[PDB]
Design a protein around this ligand. Structure first.
Ligand SMILES: Nc1ncnc2c1ncn2[C@@H]1O[C@H](COP(=O)(O)OP(=O)(O)OP(=O)(O)O)[C@@H](O)[C@H]1O
Ligand SMILES: Nc1ncnc2c1ncn2[C@@H]1O[C@H](COP(=O)(O)OP(=O)(O)OP(=O)(O)O)[C@@H](O)[C@H]1O
Ligand SMILES: *[C@@H]1O[C@H](CO)[C@@H](O[C@@H]2O[C@H](CO)[C@@H](O)[C@H](O)[C@H]2NC(C)=O)[C@H](O)[C@H]1NC(C)=O
Ligand SMILES: *[C@@H]1O[C@H](CO)[C@@H](O)[C@H](O)[C@H]1NC(C)=O
Ligand SMILES: *[C@@H]1O[C@H](CO)[C@@H](O)[C@H](O)[C@H]1NC(C)=O
Ligand SMILES: [Mg+2]
Ligand SMILES: [Mg+2]
Length: 1928
């Protein structure tokens, strides 16, 4: 078995060497997409994210002001890269740098000061004592005005001096009176107690001013609000303000919608000041809880009653600063001689001295108290208008739960609906509480995290720090409302007024690396791993079906090879390139940074196993079809439909078990997908497969792993091989036996080689009754001439004898072995040579013979000897051995096929038409070869040459219609049947003269100057014929007339339409032909048109079984959902103030939460009972590096580790100290973190635990989820007393403007300080961990707040998370899922609509390889009209499946495509895509010669380009934040050159528009930027491609013999004025040959003769015919046909030309009559006379029974009959017949001679080429023999027989030597030529005249010798042609 396998491998290697481009493309098909992937990966390296921490969010329980500050500041998770002080155990504030907190603290300080202030009383008593003791303290005009203007402290004396300078001293003495007062300067010096009173008042004023000027907050606030009121500086301004480093409010909300800030801030503030909450029936307990919640909310309502305060106290404070005597005396005390010194001493040298005070406070009419008052009034007005339409009344009582859902819907329709608290009360009664409050928080899913899943599925690095996607618990209002409700329940159950502060700190992440490309790989690996192998399966299936369809596989199996060796050879020849491609792919994945963590060896092994699976699936699929055109369309489609179950199981991901996964992967496109998924999951986790991750790949599952997938692929390969063998044995197709279903469950002295018994064959077309009964017996040492007419059952019988066609009845024993059972044993010793040349194209002749000789077991030297022997006996000139067989002619191919049937040891030879198109010269060599191998090879001759069958055939057999007619030797059928003397002489009176010399004379046939007479006396008759055209020859009942007698016993219109009428006629004829072709071919139509629609339907079905939505179960907010977790507790500042009690109540009998407390009110979670011990974990020998390196300060308490994998790696000791762990009876162990740095310890322990659990390959899950840190803050009664004293004083009242405002301010001030607080450290990886740990810490607070209870066990609160099931599922969830499924269905649509158009060229190839398209161009059909008809037909054949896909999309209700605005756009998009892709796939048949190969290539190229461009643009515009996508836009324009890219982009734009519309509900697709540009581009591309293919069809441009020399000179000097065909110096030089096949041909054919072009095989006749018709390009010379040149205008030459090519060019799906009618419609025959012309052309060449049968099922003679009939359509003046008699019975050639004679007599010409010399010697007028492209005779038949011959020729038949002795004795000179073992030939010329004399002497010596038959001819053409061929 090894030699045949190595021979087949050598053949495949030679085939791949001859076509290196195809092999390179097959290897690099995955390389293209993989290089694109690594290139787009190089632009996105793994981002090294630093180890950053997150700020702490403040809860409303810790204060509304810090709550708002935490909402605004850390709304984006800035990741400050360093541990913030909020994470420190001591300080928790982190907001002491903001000016708002400083302003509130200064307001509290001012309130306390006013509580302890007496300055008002001091100034009041000072005013009182000055009024009781002093009782007085409140030239004319020129002096009065001067005194009024100069009324100052010291200006009085200056004014007095200025007055006295111009007046008398009378105003001076009075000046002495005012000098003692000094403007109330020394007035306190007079009294005693008034001095002390003024001193105390001045001290109080100094302290008050010092406080007011050390506030220092309102100054910064004013500066910031004046600087803010554009660029990015406003962000920093508002950050410095709020942090550290009806239609009016609607308009404000609209301005905020423009987001001049972080959008997350607005997203979080939307449910705060717009949303509204609701609760259950009004239970008085629930009523009190809601009232406490309302109080907590209205704590922030200090700005509501602020306007009421500023609308009542503004006049009082305005008059207090304008005309109050107290402020006047303050101003007086502020300015004096020593008061300024006192103020400077009391100010301690601070800023804003007394001058600034008097400039700001004292102003009667640039900055004073007036501008400050206006500014604060404007600020109060702005604050009131901002807090005007805010709904602080968010509390609506509801009577039930269905009404709750209805009101929730109604409020969400108004876009104002916050969370809803649903209690579980049993009775609306005055009971306090059931001690176990179960409450649910129902809100919209857009603001609450999804509850269907509790984890992110597969583990991926990242702290989940997206403030909008995965942080919905902090901006949606869930955690805040949860904390508020918990605090309310705690206050109701206990009654304590103080509230423990609550903070939420997100756990930091240890400098992980985010790689979005890893996610892209995990999402698109099984998708991008499909097309690269779809191309491979298409190529492999196409090649296999083309090998087994062209009878190559069957011929090879007949030659001696079995099936298993061929299957192994195909497997190896498909695996080696696939192995190279897999190795290159592994190298690309390893070097391209795509799979850096996986071992390349494991990837290579996996890819090799997948390639084996792929090859066996290819074998299985190929064994299902028989035609390559159907397989080329079915293979990839089936391979892609079998992959859909993988996508189904991926979309399900639930309720699928191990056995279900096995059954889904039984087809095994799902095993490779699961393997790629596991590889991507291992890569995303930074592990890979280092030959040890096998057998364990569970994300969340039991057993399914990678080794399971490998074993399943092995089992699937075994099953595929078994099924392939079974199907190929049972259903092989049309070339099988086949095997049954229940498996394996008259020479009497010869060997009698082959014997048939009652052979019956029935074809399934019309039951095809052709072979009724055959009892033929073939012997060993005899050549049985299996003769028969066209369709008599010769080829069918010879195929039944082989393994080609199965017999319906009877049997056939070959060498004693049956064919129905022992077929392989017979084929092991069987040689065949069929009627059609079945041979490889890439292999040469010598390689062919070497292969077919080594296939039988001959040695290398023996094979070389056999090659040389065959090359010398067949007649090979030894120059075509190293040339490809595809370049050979018909004769050379036939000789090679005959030679390949005799090589090696084959005792049974079957030759069907061994001489078809072979010259009479090589026929002699074939005869010698058959005679040399006539010992025991059982040669079965089936030819149409009567001479060959009579010479070689020892026992001929003539049949008809399958029934046996006659069997026997030549003597038997010549003596039994009609015998006599047949006289044939070339040419009324002759009949009279032959009837007067002999008694019996009869005329039987007169066709082509033959005039054959039969004569059953003779010497005188021959003398009379001789002495009185010069061609006398008689014979004795040859085989021709015998066959004729056996067979006997068993027109161009009158209209000639032209112009538009002819154009329309040809168009309708082409459309009707295409319709007939599509009607009679339903399997191909279903596989190429309806199969993509079925594929789209199956894809939509698989995408329709997605899991249902709208189901959100109630998820409990408890941490007991993740099995293994690690909690930690931190006790900061243990001073027994408020922390130790909560710490004890947190780890006591009630436990961590409400899990097990007098029962388990949580489903399916039993808690452990007995565990209580504080045991420190065992620390290894690593305490020395920590003790000797002591003095570990709080900053960096453990040796930090660098971050260059995912997480850093460095030796143990990262945490530093193992804390004592203890199980708290809740299935989780807590660790005490007292006095430990929380952030660094947590980071280091996370790192070390991840490293330890990843080193063991355990699929690392989350380690910790939450922890608590209890601390204290660095009062209430004081500020309450301050508020009370402020209300009691200064005109106390009870209005709703001042008293309510003061009470609200006091409530706000007392709600900011916290005695103790708790920081909940939560990891955002858990989707519900923060809320659960909040509930846990609230339960702990409740347990610690109850006083003197019997037991704190039965106390507890539980929270449920039940999202709204109203209308939708989520935003991002659907935005990803629908996006993915739409991308999938768009890829499927691209696949389908790319599989369709590539078939349109297939038929075109079926017209271009053959001369069918050439014959259509010979008629009046122009290329433009033909291309237009093809375009219309393909447009219909494309809109049929387009309509099918549209109907499927309508029925599936895919709102993304068949919506009210996208359905017509989608239809137009599909129409334009087809209109643009059809003329793009049209210019592809001119380069390919195989229809299935071009089909596969075009389909693969289209799908690759389209899908790759679509997915590239998608991943570049969707998941890219860099500006590189901009370049992609330009690339779009470039990619606009591919229509598939335009279709994909249109689909993607429709999907994105629908997604944006749905997000808006949470634009027309005909715009320019949208699909409209794609439509315009498709239209332009269609027009341009149609023009391009039309231009392509127009080639972008629209010493010799005496007679030969005489004719050449006659043509040169003077042109013929009457000859139709005039050829001048015709020359043809093929490429890379340097030897012209035809050169220097100059002939003139008049319109009244018959021209014959004879020549040896390879002379240049077919090339000359192709140059005349226009198939090839003429190099030199010209050819005028009816005064029309070829290069000038070929249309006029074609309009008067009838071409009959050498090879049959007919449609396999059209009948003969339909062919004739079509070719008549093309040539201008009117429809009224089409039927008559068709009937005439049919009846003129027989075909009566075959007139209604398909031409593809015709016989060897019926095809030539149809070709000649089509050539005789239209009645052209010159009919070119190229081998029209090739394999036809004598009746067909007689009919053809009659047709040619009728054509010549009608006034036309016939350029005939044939290989039978009798034909051209009979009917042809002027003949020309060409050799190597040069003529030799160029004359008439009689002139040729006279100048190249003389005398007579004798053909005798018989034991051989006595005949030669007699011929040498009776004749002196007679050359013995063409000596055979059966016949002899002698020549007269060296003898005398009087042929009657030699006839008489041969008659007198016939009885003495053993001569069987004798014949005489007068210089026949056979010997002349043999001599001409032997010359050169
Ligand atoms: N694939 C087919 N489908 C239907 N009928 C067929 C098919 N192949 C052959 N036939 C029929 O079987 C009959 C047997 O014809 P056969 O093959 O003997 O012709 P032939 O002897 O090769 O002709 P020639 O002698 O001119 O070469 C024919 O009449 C033909 O119509
Ligand atoms: N496509 C081709 N490429 C290379 N050489 C070619 C090609 N076609 C024909 N030839 C050359 O032309 C020669 C045959 O010429 P042509 O086709 O005129 O003869 P033919 O009429 O087919 O012979 P026959 O009478 O045996 O059918 C061959 O020797 C071959 O080398
Ligand atoms: C719950 O609190 C809101 C304010 O947060 C209270 O609404 C106040 O009273 C009436 C409406 O009831 C309005 O005129 C006031 O302007 C509201 N604000 C203030 C600051 O008074 C509401 O009354 C409270 N609910 C109950 C039952 O008292
Ligand atoms: C605010 O916190 C800081 C800590 O950064 C502290 O130094 C400062 O004293 C605090 N201010 C107070 C307590 O008023
Ligand atoms: C949502 O769930 C409630 C359960 O009380 C049900 O009454 C309602 O019909 C559901 N909504 C939809 C749209 O099914
Ligand atoms: Mg045949
Ligand atoms: Mg030829």
């Amino acid at each position: 078995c090894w030699p045949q396998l190595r021979l087949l491998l050598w053949k495949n290697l030679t085939f791949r060497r001859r076509q290196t481009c195809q092999l390179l493309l097959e290897v690099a098909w995955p390389l293209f997409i993989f290089l694109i992937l690594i290139s787009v990966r190089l632009s996105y390296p793994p981002y090294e994210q630093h180890e950053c921490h997150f700020p702490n969010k403040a809860m409303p329980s810790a204060g509304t002001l810090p709550w708002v500050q935490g909402i605004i500041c850390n709304a984006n998770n800035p990741c400050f890269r360093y541990p913030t002080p909020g994470e420190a155990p001591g300080v928790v504030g982190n907001f002491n740098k903001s000016i708002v907190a400083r302003l509130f603290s200064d307001a509290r300080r001012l309130l306390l000061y006013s509580q302890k202030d007496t300055s008002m009383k001091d100034m009041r008593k000072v005013l009182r004592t000055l009024q009781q003791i002093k009782k007085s303290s409140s030239k004319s005009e020129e002096m009065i005005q001067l005194g009024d203007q100069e009324v100052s402290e010291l200006c009085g004396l200056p004014r007095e001096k200025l007055a006295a300078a111009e007046r008398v001293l009378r105003s001076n003495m009075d000046i002495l009176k005012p000098i003692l007062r000094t403007l109330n300067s020394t007035s306190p010096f007079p009294s005693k107690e008034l001095a002390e009173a003024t001193k105390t008042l001045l001290h109080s004023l100094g302290t008050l001013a010092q406080e007011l000027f050390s506030m220092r907050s309102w100054s910064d606030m004013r500066q910031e609000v004046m600087f803010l009121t554009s660029s990015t500086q406003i962000y920093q301004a508002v950050s410095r303000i709020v942090c550290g480093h009806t239609p009016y409010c609607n308009d404000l909300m609209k301005n905020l919608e423009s987001s001049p800030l972080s959008r997350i801030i607005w997203k979080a503030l939307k449910p705060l000041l717009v949303g509204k909450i609701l609760y259950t029936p009004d239970t008085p307990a629930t009523r009190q809880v809601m009232a406490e919640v309302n109080k907590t909310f209205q704590e922030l309502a200090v700005f509501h009653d602020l306007e009421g305060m500023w609308e009542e106290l503004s006049p009082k404070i305005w008059t207090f600063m304008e005309n109050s005597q107290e402020m006047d005396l303050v101003r007086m005390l502020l300015d004096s001689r020593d008061n300024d010194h006192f103020w400077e001493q009391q100010l301690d040298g601070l800023d804003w001295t007394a001058q600034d005070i008097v400039a700001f406070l004292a102003k009667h009419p640039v900055y004073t108290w007036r501008e400050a008052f206006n500014e604060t009034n404007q600020a109060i007005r702005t604050i009131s208008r901002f807090m005007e339409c805010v709904n602080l009344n968010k509390l609506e009582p509801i009577a039930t739960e269905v009404w709750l859902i209805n009101k929730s819907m109604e409020l969400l329709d108004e876009r104002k609906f916050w969370a809803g608290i649903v209690f579980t009360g049993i009775t609306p009664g005055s009971i306090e509480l059931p001690h176990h409050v179960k409450y649910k928080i129902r809100m919209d899913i857009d603001n609450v995290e999804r509850t269907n899943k509790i984890k992110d599925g597969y583990w991926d690095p990242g702290p989940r720090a997206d403030p909008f996607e995965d942080m919905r618990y902090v901006w949606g209002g869930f955690a805040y409302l949860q904390d508020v409700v918990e605090q309310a329940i705690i206050r109701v159950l206990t009654g304590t007024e103080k509230k423990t502060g609550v903070y939420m700190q997100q756990m930091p992440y240890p400098c992980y690396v985010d790689d979005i490309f890893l996610r892209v790989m995990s999402r698109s690996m099984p998708l991008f791993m499909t097309l690269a192998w779809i191309y491979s399966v298409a190529v492999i299936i196409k090649g296999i079906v083309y090998e087994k369809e062209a009878r190559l596989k069957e011929t090879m199996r007949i030659m001696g090879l079995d099936n298993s060796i061929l299957w192994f050879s195909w497997f190896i020849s498909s695996l080696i390139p696939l192995l190279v491609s897999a190795g290159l792919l592994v190298v690309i994945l390893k070097l391209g940074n795509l799979l850096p963590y996986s071992d390349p060896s494991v990837v290579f092994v996996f890819l090799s196993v997948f390639a084996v699976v792929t090859i066996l699936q290819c074998f299985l699929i190929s064994t299902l079809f028989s035609r390559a055109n159907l397989a080329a369309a079915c293979g990839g489609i089936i391979y892609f439909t079998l992959y859909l179950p993988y996508v189904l199981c991926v979309a399900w991901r639930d309720y699928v078990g191990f056995t279900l996964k096995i059954f889904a992967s039984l087809l095994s496109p799902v095993a490779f997908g699961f393997g790629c998924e596991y590889f991507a999951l291992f890569e995303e986790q930074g592990i890979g497969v280092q030959w040890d991750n096998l057998f364990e790949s569970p994300v969340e599952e039991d057993g399914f792993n990678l080794t399971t997938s490998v074993s399943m692929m092995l089992f699937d390969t075994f099953l595929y091989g078994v099924m392939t063998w079974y199907i190929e044995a049972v259903f092989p197709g049309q070339y099988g036996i086949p095997r049954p279903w229940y498996f394996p469950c008259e020479p009497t002295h010869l060997k009698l080689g082959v014997s048939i018994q009652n052979l019956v064959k029935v074809y399934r077309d019309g039951m095809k009754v052709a072979v009724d009964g055959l009892a033929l017996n073939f012997y060993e040492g005899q050549i049985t001439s299996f003769l028969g007419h066209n369709g008599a059952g010769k080829t069918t019988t010879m195929s039944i004898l082989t393994g080609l066609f199965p017999p319906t009845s009877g049997t056939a024993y070959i060498l004693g072995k049956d064919i129905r059972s022992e077929m392989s044993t017979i084929r092991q010793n069987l040689g065949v040579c069929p009627q059609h040349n079945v041979l490889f194209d890439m292999l040469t002749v010598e390689e062919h013979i070497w292969f077919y000789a080594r296939l039988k077991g001959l040695s290398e030297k023996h094979v070389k000897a056999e090659m040389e022997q065959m090359a010398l006996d067949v007649g090979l000139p030894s120059s075509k051995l190293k040339s490809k067989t595809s370049q050979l002619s018909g004769g050379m191919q036939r000789k090679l096929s005959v030679a390949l049937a005799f090589v090696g040891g084959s005792k049974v030879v079957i030759l069907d038409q061994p001489t078809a198109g072979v010259d009479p010269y090589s026929r002699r060599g074939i005869w010698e070869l058959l005679l040399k191998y006539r010992q025991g090879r059982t040669i079965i001759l089936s030819t149409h040459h009567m001479d060959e069958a009579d010479v070689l055939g020892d026992r001929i057999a003539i049949i008809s219609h399958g029934k046996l007619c006659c069997v026997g030797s030549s003597l038997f059928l010549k003596n039994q049947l009609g015998t006599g003397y047949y006289l044939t002489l070339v040419k009324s009176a002759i009949s009279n003269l032959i009837r007067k010399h002999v008694s019996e004379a009869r005329l039987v046939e007169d066709i082509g100057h033959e005039l054959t007479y039969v004569l059953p006396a003779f010497v005188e008759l021959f003398h009379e014929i001789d002495d009185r055209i010069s061609s006398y020859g008689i014979s004795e009942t040859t085989l021709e007339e015998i066959f004729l007698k056996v067979a006997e016993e068993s027109g161009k219109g009158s209209y000639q339409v032209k112009g538009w009428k002819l154009t329309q006629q040809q168009f309708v004829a082409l459309l009707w032909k295409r319709l007939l072709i599509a009607r009679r071919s339903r399997k191909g139509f279903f596989a190429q048109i309806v199969l993509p629609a079925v594929f789209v339907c199956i894809a939509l079905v698989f995408s329709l079984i997605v899991p249902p939505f709208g189901k959100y179960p109630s998820l409990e907010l408890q941490p007991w959902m993740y099995n293994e977790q690690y909690t930690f507790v931190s006790n900061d500042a243990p001073e027994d103030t408020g922390t130790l009690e909560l710490l004890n109540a947190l780890t006591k009998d009630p436990g961590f939460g409400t899990r097990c407390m007098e029962g388990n009110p949580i489903p399916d979670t039993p808690c452990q009972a007995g565990e209580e011990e504080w045991t420190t974990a065992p620390v290894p020998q690593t305490i020395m590096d920590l003790f000797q390196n002591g003095n570990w300060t709080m900053q960096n308490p453990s040796p930090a580790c660098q971050c260059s994998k995912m997480l850093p790696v460095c030796p143990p000791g990262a945490g530093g100290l193992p804390p004592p762990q203890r199980k708290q009876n809740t299935a989780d162990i807590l660790q005490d973190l007292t006095g430990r740095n929380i952030s660094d310890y947590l980071v280091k322990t996370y790192v070390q635990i991840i490293a330890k659990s990843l080193k063991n390959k355990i699929w690392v899950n989350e380690f910790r989820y939450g922890g608590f840190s209890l601390g204290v803050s660095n009062p209430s009664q004081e500020v309450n007393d301050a508020i009370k004293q402020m209300k009691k004083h200064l005109k106390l009242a009870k209005d709703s403007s001042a008293d309510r405002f003061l009470n609200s301010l006091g409530r706000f001030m007392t709600g900011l300080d916290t005695k103790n607080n708790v920081k909940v450290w939560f990891n955002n990886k858990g989707w519900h961990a923060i809320s659960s740990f909040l509930n846990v810490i609230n339960n702990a607070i409740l347990r610690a707040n109850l006083q003197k209870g019997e037991n704190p066990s039965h106390y507890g609160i539980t929270a449920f998370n039940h999202p709204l099931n109203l209308t939708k599922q989520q935003l991002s969830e659907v935005a990803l899922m629908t996006t993915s499924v739409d991308v999938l269905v768009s890829i499927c649509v691209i696949f389908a609509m790319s599989f369709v158009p590539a078939s349109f060229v297939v038929f075109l190839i079926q017209e271009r390889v053959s001369k069918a398209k050439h014959l259509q161009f010979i008629s009046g059909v122009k290329p433009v009209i033909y291309w237009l008809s093809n375009f219309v037909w393909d447009m219909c054949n494309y809109v049929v499946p387009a309509t099918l896909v549209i109907i499927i999309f309508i029925c599936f209700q895919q709102k993304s495509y068949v919506s009210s605005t996208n359905l017509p756009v989608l239809a137009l998009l599909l129409l334009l895509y087809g209109w643009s892709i059809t003329p793009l796939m049209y210019p592809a048949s001119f380069v390919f010669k195989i229809p299935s190969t071009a089909y596969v290539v075009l389909t693969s190229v289209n799908l690759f380009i389209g899908i790759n461009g679509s997915v590239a643009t998608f991943v570049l515009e969707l998941f890219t934040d860099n500006k590189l996508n901009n370049i992609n836009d330009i690339l779009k324009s470039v990619f606009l050159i591919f229509p598939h890219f335009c279709l994909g982009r249109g689909l993607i734009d429709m999907v994105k528009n629908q997604a944006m519309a749905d997000a808006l509900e949470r634009v027309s697709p005909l715009s320019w930027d949208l699909v409209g540009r794609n439509l315009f581009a498709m239209a332009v591309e269609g027009v341009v491609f149609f023009l391009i293919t039309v231009l392509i069809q127009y080639r972008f441009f629209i010493d010799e013999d005496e007679d030969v020399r005489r004719e050449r000179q006659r043509i040169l000097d003077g042109g013929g004025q009457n000859d139709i065909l005039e050829i001048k110096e015709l020359t043809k030089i093929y490429r890379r040959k340097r030897k012209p096949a035809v050169d220097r041909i100059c002939v003139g054919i008049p319109p009244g003769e018959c021209f014959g072009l004879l020549g040896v095989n390879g002379a240049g006749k077919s090339s000359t015919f192709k140059m005349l018709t226009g198939d090839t390009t003429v190099t030199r010379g010209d050819a005028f046909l009816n005064k029309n040149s070829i290069l000038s205008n070929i249309h006029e030459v074609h309009q008067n030309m009838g071409y009959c090519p050498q090879f049959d060019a007919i449609t396999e799906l059209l009948t003969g009559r339909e062919h004739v009618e079509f070719f008549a419609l093309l040539r201008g025959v009117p429809e009224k006379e089409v039927g008559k012309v068709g009937e005439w052309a049919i009846r003129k060449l027989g075909l009566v029974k075959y007139g209604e049968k398909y031409a593809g099922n015709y016989s060897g003679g019926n095809k030539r009959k149809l070709s000649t009939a089509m050539a005789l359509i239209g009645g052209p003046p010159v009919v070119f017949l190229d081998q029209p008699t090739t394999g036809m019975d004598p009746k067909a050639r007689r009919f053809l001679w009659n047709c040619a004679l009728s054509v010549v007599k009608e006034g036309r010409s016939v350029v005939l080429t044939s290989h039978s010399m009798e034909e051209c010697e009979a009917l042809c007028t002027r003949m020309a023999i060409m050799v190597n492209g040069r003529f030799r005779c160029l004359g008439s038949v009689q002139h040729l027989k006279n100048r190249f011959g003389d005398g007579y020729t004798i053909v005798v038949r018989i034991d051989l030597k006595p005949v030669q002795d007699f011929f040498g004795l009776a004749f002196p000179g007679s050359v013995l030529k063409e000596k055979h073992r059966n016949m002899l030939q002698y020549q007269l010329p060296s003898s005398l005249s009087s042929l009657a004399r030699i006839f008489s002497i041969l008659s007198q010596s016939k009885k003495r010798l053993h001569i069987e038959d004798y014949s005489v001819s007068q210089t026949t053409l056979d010997q002349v042609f043999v001599n001409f061929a032997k010359d050169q």
